[PDB]
């Protein structure tokens, strides 16, 4: 009778622990996906920002040189 | 002068509140699994 | 006697597992909050960056056109 | 005009797929630990 | 020309070292819960 | 005999739970490190972006004033 109680409580606890570990795995997977997407987003932003500052630079040097020609 | 468009860069958000709620629910319900001989 | 040992060990293990699951839940909540704040930060940065490049553009086109008028 | 270089700014990526696989493997294997008196 | 100020954009940091330490402590202490009949 | 079965199943379950908690701790540590590195990256990007917009501004005001002098 006490053995059946121990077995039932242990089986209930193991079921709850299985559900909780599945939940933790799903949460870690979602967090991994989101953190990796945000990392790719920041990297793509850094690349496009470098390109845009390169373009803005080149344009500003064109302006400065052609205005040195002006004056 | 046409600068590159970056408006498409989007950062997703995570929604693991279901899993956190399940974890706290299990941490509370495991008291119903203690053995009281 | 062995049943009391099994019950005591199981209760200790379930208490430790409860503490550990509360810790995992708190950690996942903190990570969710921080990842979401960083996502909002990157999105707001993208919006402000788009606005600032729009302004810098418009200004550069003003400069280029008014210097075409100059020369 | 020399604008500051920002190409060095890099965002790392996380690789916890081993741990997620281990967690799901344990959540599946804990059925082999149930007591069947 | 007054460009928009973006210095207010801040990215928070997470501090879950307490929870990771607790998890490793429990993974070590669960050896004190094994049954030795 | 049933007590030995309960003890063996409990020890196996506790070993699996230990492995799973070590895995969760390692995963949370890696996620913490990566999220903190990405936060430092976004903050450094914000600082450098503020500096670069300051420089681009000052340059554009120089251009505008010196072209007001021109015309």
Residue numbers in the entry:
A (entry chain A), C (entry chain C), F (entry chain B): 918 to 988
B (entry chain F), D (entry chain D), E (entry chain E): 1164 to 1200
From the manuscript:
In each case, the process of viral membrane fusion is mediated by the trimeric viral spike glycoprotein (S) that is cleaved into S1 and S2 subunits by multiple host proteases upon infection. Two heptad repeat regions, HR1 and HR2, distant from each other in the prefusion S, drive membrane fusion by assembly into a six-helix bundle. We therefore designed a scaffold to efficiently determine structures of the postfusion HR1HR2 bundle and its mutants to near-atomic resolution by single-particle cryo-EM.
The L938F mutation fills a hole in the HR1 bundle, but it decreases the fusion activity to 67% of wild type. However, the observed decreases in fusion activities for the L938F mutation cannot be as easily explained by the observed structure—the mutant phenylalanine side chain is well determined in the map and it does not produce an apparent change of the surrounding atoms. It is possible, or even likely, that the mutations affect the membrane fusion mechanism in a way that is not related to the postfusion state; for example, this mutation as well as the others could affect the stability of the prefusion spike, or the transition from the prefusion state to the extended intermediate state of the S2 (14). Overall, none of the five single and the Omicron triple mutations dramatically altered the architecture of the HR1HR2 bundle, as indicated by the small RMSDs between the wild-type and the mutant structures.
